[PDB]
Design an enzyme around this catalytic site. Structure first.
Site, PDB file in Angstrom:
ATOM      1  CB  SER A 228      -1.086  -0.092   1.048  1.00 33.53           C
ATOM      2  OG  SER A 228      -2.076   0.848   0.752  1.00 33.53           O
TER       3      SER A 228
ATOM      4  CG  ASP B 202      -7.106  -3.022  -3.184  1.00 31.64           C
ATOM      5  OD1 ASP B 202      -7.932  -2.292  -2.571  1.00 31.64           O
ATOM      6  OD2 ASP B 202      -5.883  -3.070  -2.921  1.00 31.64           O
TER       7      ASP B 202
ATOM      8  CG  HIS C  11      -5.873  -2.805   0.647  1.00 32.39           C
ATOM      9  ND1 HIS C  11      -5.086  -2.311  -0.370  1.00 32.39           N
ATOM     10  CD2 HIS C  11      -5.341  -2.345   1.799  1.00 32.39           C
ATOM     11  CE1 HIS C  11      -4.125  -1.573   0.147  1.00 32.39           C
ATOM     12  NE2 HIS C  11      -4.258  -1.575   1.462  1.00 32.39           N
TER      13      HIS C  11
HETATM   14  C1  LIG Z   1      -2.518   1.832   1.716  1.00 36.35           C
HETATM   15  N1  LIG Z   1      -1.968   1.988   2.852  1.00 36.35           N
HETATM   16  C2  LIG Z   1      -3.644   2.718   1.264  1.00 36.35           C
HETATM   17  C3  LIG Z   1      -3.173   3.684   0.191  1.00 36.35           C
HETATM   18  C4  LIG Z   1      -2.677   4.878   0.966  1.00 36.35           C
HETATM   19  F1  LIG Z   1      -1.385   4.645   1.343  1.00 36.35           F
HETATM   20  C5  LIG Z   1      -3.574   4.923   2.183  1.00 36.35           C
HETATM   21  N2  LIG Z   1      -4.149   3.588   2.311  1.00 36.35           N
HETATM   22  C6  LIG Z   1      -5.037   3.129   3.182  1.00 36.35           C
HETATM   23  O1  LIG Z   1      -5.368   1.958   3.196  1.00 36.35           O
HETATM   24  C7  LIG Z   1      -5.712   4.064   4.162  1.00 36.35           C
HETATM   25  N3  LIG Z   1      -7.136   4.099   3.762  1.00 36.35           N
HETATM   26  C8  LIG Z   1      -5.509   3.589   5.597  1.00 36.35           C
HETATM   27  C9  LIG Z   1      -6.226   4.497   6.612  1.00 36.35           C
HETATM   28  C10 LIG Z   1      -5.958   4.027   8.036  1.00 36.35           C
HETATM   29  C11 LIG Z   1      -4.462   4.061   8.289  1.00 36.35           C
HETATM   30  C12 LIG Z   1      -3.763   3.089   7.354  1.00 36.35           C
HETATM   31  C13 LIG Z   1      -4.005   3.521   5.910  1.00 36.35           C
END
Ligand SMILES: *C(#N)[C]1[C][C](F)[C]N1C(=O)[C]([N])[C]1[C][C][C][C][C]1
Ligand SMILES: *C(#N)[C]1[C][C](F)[C]N1C(=O)[C]([N])[C]1[C][C][C][C][C]1
Lengths: 840, 848
Positions: free
Chosen positions: A697, A775, A807
């Protein structure tokens, strides 16, 4: 110089067995969602029964258990509490919620309870069930068969809550509308009529009582309705119950398509996904007023709307972050954000502010004029920042002394740059704004003056208010229990402090462990789930008392173990935590896994595991042998493994976090490399000619940035689920850290990997892209658009897809293949003799 | 022993340059040779020219496909070779900027040309009609108005229609009128008066395809992809006069209802959208569209104005009148316009019927029930459909474009030429005369007709051709009939399965077939409507394509006896290309009882005592032949590139491939994937015993589509032989492929569970290797033909089974590769993969 160490070159089959054998000895939920109920039996041996959710063992369902807390203990011994089971026995909506909540548990994910009746209410799959334990009916000595709540509803019922005022009534969501149901009389009644299950989502974009995607994904709000905790009595002998709810209209939100899991179908599901710079849902508050007769039959239901539109009453608010009621039910409250997420407001909303929905215009005016001008929304707290508001779950409202005064504890980073607790008392005055006069209010018209704002806590450390961290307030002793980083940014600890005359902060947990805690509602016990780098997670129960001379002062005694750890695992050596003083002015922390059977005079290939985004800290004093076990596996094969918490990461204050505002991707690798260079000067065994990087991510994103920016340093990058274009990511996250794209043209360009595909290497065996095909968070399009530009630019890449995964990686076979392929890729393109041999 | 040859290990950048340098000399070669010829007589007794020929072509590389003419002289200097000048007909319209409907059509037709793809002409007026991009245009040349000596301004057919107009056709009865499709309905437009009129009202552009699945005048997906029918409407070639001094024009059309057809989603090309387009895709074993015939009757006044339009439907439903018919394969009219005709298939594609449909069989569409009965009783019982030909087979009907109807001598008799594989197992021409009797079935009586009730008796059925060789009737190959001399010109395989040739024979008293083209080349021919000339586009393995014009004469004593004289060159070839060595064609006697043919590209600078890595390029499916005596230095140039690097390259036409008759083709009925690799390996082993330079330890396989499918089957079945497989756009589950293709070759899946299982790669994922660097999957992400899901589901099972794979996606590509950058990357990655995992020292060194 030193001679290079080459990792042993295993075949694919060999590696598969190796990984299988090391997983087979070594995923099961620790106890959580604790609640304490007093026994109230003066002759009996137990003070309390604790209830909690947990898994009994590996491949078993998450369910409700209880344990018995004795009045006294043998202090020569250690008491292990028995887990007594309380019970005797996925839709798209469940799948998605589980994705948003990040839960891998099967079975009961949460429960509701009503103290006065002993009624538990919980979802278990398809069904909503209830049972009684620990009210008037008494305490079971064996598991209970639950009772199914009958329904006529055709589809999955979600988000069940008991009415705190009458535990015969529940509410739930069905096809995005709110229903109520009486678990004694069996009466079932639909409250809202905003959605039609039979229509296409493309024409039917309204919902009531549900949090939309961004709220679940980016703010951790999963519910959109809140029972009023008290019932208003009627002259008939009946009563009025009330539900506050969010009503959403997603009509103007962009529709994307995500591949349906049923790959055979060759179809795609529609999602309302508000991408950066585009419309969020049109929100408002509504209220349902439910009149019940003397014997629990519904008389009538009146749906009520705000007297003036949300946009007028709450100028500039984009997001409803949190909502609830005051303890007495006099006001609904809400925490509200502007679009840029730099202004927070805490607002009280009287029920008198809502009127019947009436499409008839003569009658509507009658209803508007019947509400006095004196009834307005009350902004009891407003704050601003140049960085961002981090939403949290801390907000405690005291009982009202005076009709014109409200007292509360809130937490904030906006004064000092660290999250701290503040006791605030605000004045509830009549507004200057009079509706009568037929104008619109100026922004400041609903602001209440602040009588007092005292800091309960202060310093270079944070109070924690997310991920189940909250406060517990003792109104008798005038104390507040909270979790914080005061002793160390690498350990979470439990603290107590006076809210009335704040001074000495007393640490209740023991140093040398990070702690995750729950305080009993009765404030005489707490539980800590705790671990450290050397020792797996334990859960223990501690009794709280105060000396005879001073009820302010708190002490702790160990009472019992709920969960004993496995001892140290035999085939697992933990990393060392290190730190370095950065040129940036901050101390940065990291973890080093040295190679096992480390031969002298040899230098070893190095893998940097990375996340590096906001809201996460990787480096701390917690057991990493479950989640990051494969980092140890890599060390066992002869990789050096490194993890570094760069600037932007969590638990260091808002200024530290704020380092990448508008500049995501531009700074993180400088820190990573600085850490890497610190290590390499201190330890000659790090071969800087053979460094790889890997993350998922944000970690995938940074792995790409590392190869793109610093190909001189990073030989291979393995990017899982990478963000490659910040314009494809959502409003709530992206705009928080990066602003609107028009206000940050260069930041969006430089932080978007796929706009810079020309900067990748023209040598193969360096870039590996991994993605879950389905995802819906980080769309596969991030990967496919990158590849589009890589192809256009004539650059090589390697690709793996996980066609059954979103994801997360949920199916074990998918994870086995990921692990195997990762190790094999590293072997073949970084660590082995053949890797160095194939280099051109 | 012999020493293994290792290919030179180039870097990625080096290989890119190498590939660029070798394409840069051969950038002239992507340019369409002259086609869609037509001959028009000058009729000028003082003039020096007999004819003007018109044709489509490209002037050179990076120029649009347009209309040209050349002048055919009355006489030639036979001491010299005449090169005909290409005079442009137009004063130039089309950029690359296509609608969805155009993109899809171009995928279905397999056309990479920009410009005018086709044209219509009307002899009596000289009116040309053609689509050039967005616009429909006309000009006049060769009629009463005369012959231009300079380019003509194309005249835009103006419109009020908002969207792309498709499939324009001239009315052969009145060349002032055209028809076209707009938003899946038929319109007409008068190019003199400018009157425009919608005929059909079945589609609503404003609705979602999910609710609005009716269309008129258009061929649905399966027809375009699997039967090469792009149009669904046919002008009646004659006009019926009215007592007023006006006329009635007629259009037969197919009306389709795709309501019950499955909807799939294919990724939208605009990847930033994160969206997917809906397609009606009849997967194997599921509903094809509900089809019927309809007729539009257009009453025109004395001065060309529309008076009225009457939409007409069959007197009884399609399912009743044409029991068992699934597909309308072809349709049109008799030359006089007395009857519409259709060629109709059953679902299993084992029964073909030719049916004549009178206009009197259609009645006005009428919602009013009292008036409907009046209309039904007004049509006599004697008026029924006439099945003039029916044939069956235990293999399959291959649809073709050969069908010629002679003028009617007698009201109760029709004479025609058709082609069939059903009698002998090779496609041959048959002259048939069918009796048009009044049917036993009487509508009046209120019953339903039994299957046989509309069958016409056959008076005579005489074979015009016979033998162990086929007449060709697809891909532009057709017949030309000379009704004066009673001859039929056709193309076939009589002289060799490796060469196509032009032949003539008498249809009245058939005997000796006369070959008109020269041996040593394969030919693609066009015969003048006047039957006094023909054109051949021809090549061989050593020589690029030429186009030449040949004059036809007969001696005064015998009009059957046809001779040929060279007249002029239309297109001279480039000579042999300088950095190209062609393959050798070989053959071997298979244990299966057939001679099988192949092509061998030997390594360049073949060192003695070395053995070389080998790459088998494969297609191996029906309707295609790779191995024949045609120039391969354009289409298969990179096979030569591989040879230049030191790979042996092999191509073999296994059983199931084309141009060997129906029995040969039928080898894999129900059994797809089970036979083809045995033939491939047998050829490979034949060569390896004959040539010690083939290293059988280092064999790779590669193909696209069916070729991708078989490449996977090779690795699955014969991992002992094939070291690596590179599968492009593979079918991995025959249940995901379409009705028209899959059911033809494999039957319905419920009746052939074992066939579908053994033929489906993805059901057998456990059989892949547990060694990496052997399997590479390639796919266009947007492919609406072979959905990406074939690959994604395969990977689903590979992952579940713990097997390694490599993958490349082409995010901007459909089934074809059209963006040049995508092709550059594909070629680069392919050569590099082969280098690193088959050919080089490092490849052998990484083998564990
Ligand atoms: C991954 N990590 C993705 C893409 C971007 F980096 C942010 N992300 C997330 O999943 C967010 N929606 C999460 C929010 C809560 C804290 C961890 C990331
Ligand atoms: C490929 N080739 C795909 C998958 C399957 F093998 C058949 N196929 C096709 O494209 C067919 N629709 C073509 C029909 C016309 C002749 C070539 C194959």
């Amino acid at each position: 110089k030193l001679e290079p160490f080459y990792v042993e070159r295993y075949s694919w089959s060999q590696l598969k067995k190796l990984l299988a054998d090391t997983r087979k000895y070594h995923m099961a939920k620790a106890p959580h969602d604790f609640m304490f109920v007093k026994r109230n039996d003066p002759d009996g041996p137990h003070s309390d029964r604790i209830y909690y959710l947990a898994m009994s063992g590996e491949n078993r369902e998450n369910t409700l258990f209880y344990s018995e807390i004795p009045k006294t203990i043998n202090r020569a011994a250690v008491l292990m509490l028995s887990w007594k089971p309380l019970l005797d026995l996925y839709s798209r909506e469940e799948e998605l919620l589980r994705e948003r909540k990040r839960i891998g548990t099967v079975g009961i994910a949460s429960y509701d309870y009503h103290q006065g009746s002993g009624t538990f209410l919980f979802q278990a799959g398809s069904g909503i069930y209830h049972v009684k334990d620990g009210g008037p009916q008494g305490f079971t000595q064996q598991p209970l068969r639950p009772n199914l709540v009958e329904t006529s509803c055709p589809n999955i019922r979600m988000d069940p809550k008991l009415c705190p005022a009458d535990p015969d009534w529940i509410a739930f969501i069905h096809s995005n509308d709110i229903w109520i149901s009486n678990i004694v009389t069996r009466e079932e009644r639909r409250l809202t009529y905003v959605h039609n299950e039979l229509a296409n989502m493309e024409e039917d974009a309204r919902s009531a009582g549900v949090a939309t995607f961004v709220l679940q994904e980016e703010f951790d709000r999963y519910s959109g309705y809140w029972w009023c905790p008290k019932a208003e009595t009627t002259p008939s002998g009946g009563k009025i119950l009330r539900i506050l709810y969010e009503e959403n209209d997603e009509s103007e939100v962009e529709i994307i398509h995500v591949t349906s899991p049923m790959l055979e179908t060759r179809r795609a599901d529609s999602f309302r996904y508000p991408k950066t710079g585009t419309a969020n849902p049109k929100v408002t508050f509504k209220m349902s007023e439910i009149m019940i007769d003397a014997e629990g039959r519904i008389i009538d239901v009146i749906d009520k709307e705000l007297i003036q539109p949300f946009e007028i009453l709450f100028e500039g608010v984009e997001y409803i972050a949190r909502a609830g009621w005051t303890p007495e039910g006099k006001y609904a409250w809400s925490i509200l954000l502007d679009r840029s997420q730099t202004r927070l407001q805490i607002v009280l909303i009287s029920p008198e502010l809502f009127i019947p929905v009436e499409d008839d215009v003569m009658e509507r005016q009658r209803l508007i004029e019947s509400v006095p001008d004196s009834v307005t929304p009350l902004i009891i707290y407003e704050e601003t920042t140049d960085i961002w508001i981090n939403i949290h779950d801390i907000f405690h409202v005291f009982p009202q002394s005076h009709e014109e005064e409200i007292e509360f504890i809130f937490a904030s980073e906006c004064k000092t740059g660290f999250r701290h607790l503040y006791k605030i008392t605000s004045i509830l005055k009549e507004s200057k704004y009079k509706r009568s006069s037929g104008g619109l209010p100026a922004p400041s018209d609903f602001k209440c003056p602040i009588k007092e704002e005292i800091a309960i806590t202060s310093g270079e450390w944070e109070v924690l208010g997310r991920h189940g961290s909250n406060i517990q307030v003792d109104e008798v002793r005038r104390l507040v229990y909270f979790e914080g980083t005061k002793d160390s940014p690498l350990e979470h600890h439990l603290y107590v402090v006076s809210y009335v005359n704040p001074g000495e902060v007393t640490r209740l947990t023991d140093r040398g462990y990070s702690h995750s805690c729950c305080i009993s509602q009765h404030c005489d016990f707490f539980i800590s789930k705790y671990s450290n780098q050397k020792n797996p997670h334990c859960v223990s129960l501690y009794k709280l008392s105060s000396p005879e001379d001073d009820p302010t002062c708190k002490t702790k005694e160990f009472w019992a173990t709920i969960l004993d750890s496995a001892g140290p695992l035999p085939d697992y050596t933990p990393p060392e935590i290190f730190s370095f003083e950065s040129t940036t002015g901050f101390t940065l922390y990291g973890m080093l896994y040295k190679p096992h059977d480390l031969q002298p005079g040899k230098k070893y290939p190095t893998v940097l595991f990375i996340y590096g985004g906001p809201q996460v800290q990787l480096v701390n004093n917690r057991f990493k042998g479950v989640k990051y076990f494969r980092l140890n596996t890599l060390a066992s094969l002869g990789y050096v493994v490194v993890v570094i918490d760069n600037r932007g990461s969590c638990h260091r204050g808002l200024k530290f976090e704020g380092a990448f505002k508008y500049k995501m991707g531009q700074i993180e690798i400088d820190d990573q490399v600085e850490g890497l260079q610190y290590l390499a000067s201190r330890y000659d065994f790090i071969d800087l000619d053979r460094v790889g990087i890997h993350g998922w991510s944000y970690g995938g994103y940074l792995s790409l940035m590392a190869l793109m920016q610093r190909s001189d340093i990073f030989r291979v990058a393995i990017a899982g689920a990478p963000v490659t274009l910040w314009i494809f990511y959502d409003t709530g996250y992206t705009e928080r850290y990066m602003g609107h794209p028009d206000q940050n043209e260069q930041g969006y360009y430089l932080g978007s990997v796929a706009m810079q595909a020309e900067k990748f290497p023209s040598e193969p065996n360096r870039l590996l892209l991994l993605h879950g095909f389905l995802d819906e968070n980080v769309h596969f399009a991030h990967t496919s658009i990158l590849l589009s530009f890589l192809v256009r630019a004539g650059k090589p890449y390697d690709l793996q897809i996980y066609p059954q995964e979103r994801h997360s990686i949920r199916v074990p076979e998918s994870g086995e293949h990921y692990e195997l392929h990762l190790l094999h890729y590293l072997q073949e393109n970084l660590g082995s003799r053949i890797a160095a041999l194939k280099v051109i």
